[PDB]
Amino acid sequence: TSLRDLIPKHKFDNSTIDQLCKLIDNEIEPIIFDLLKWLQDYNWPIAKDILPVVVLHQSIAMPHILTILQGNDIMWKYWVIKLMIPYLIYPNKQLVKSELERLSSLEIINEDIREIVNLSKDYLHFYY
């Protein structure tokens, strides 16, 4: 329950950031998904401090990242893909390729879809 207190409570809340920046992968794992939720919108002031943390602990983040990519929250997967994919070390990069391919193949029916299809296409082109 002490760990869960380290989770930001609102979009401006960096009170726990120093404590967070100190944990090892297995110390932060239990709340990694909770931290990833603060990337649903990167324009939230706290997203800029959460992002480095989750990238640094990317290896234990992966199953949760895939869940997001397999979800229906377009904005959330857009930020996750855009911000995290270029900073995934090789083995983790290969884990998410599947989702990028899938997303790049979607029919473009609105602008939100077009954004994530074109990002997926550019990222497959560049990174893989």
Add this chain to the structure above:
Amino acid sequence: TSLRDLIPKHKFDNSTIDQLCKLIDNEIEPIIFDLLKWLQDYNWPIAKDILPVVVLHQSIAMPHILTILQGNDIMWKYWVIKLMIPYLIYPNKQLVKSELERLSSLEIINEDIREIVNLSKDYLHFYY
């Protein structure tokens, strides 16, 4: 020199990437600066696979990032700032603030420098 064999030999050389991704901070330290040199130009194909490694070992990378920001290689410091600064965890972010401040204050005499001055400005505004 077993370790140095993991430094890519040329701008397409990803032959050592799998091994690099298995090291921890203190193993990789002795070549972190050699790895940082591969960000002198992020269009080099190997750069995209080195960036995840250097960010992941950012804590032993900081004195060497400072050295790069204190050098006179424009493009190198453009990429290092642009690519690494958003992904520094709080305490490493703090260490580099000084160099950003200094760079945003440079008189723009050689116009090639503008991108560094203005990037530092933008990043001071956004991340701090």
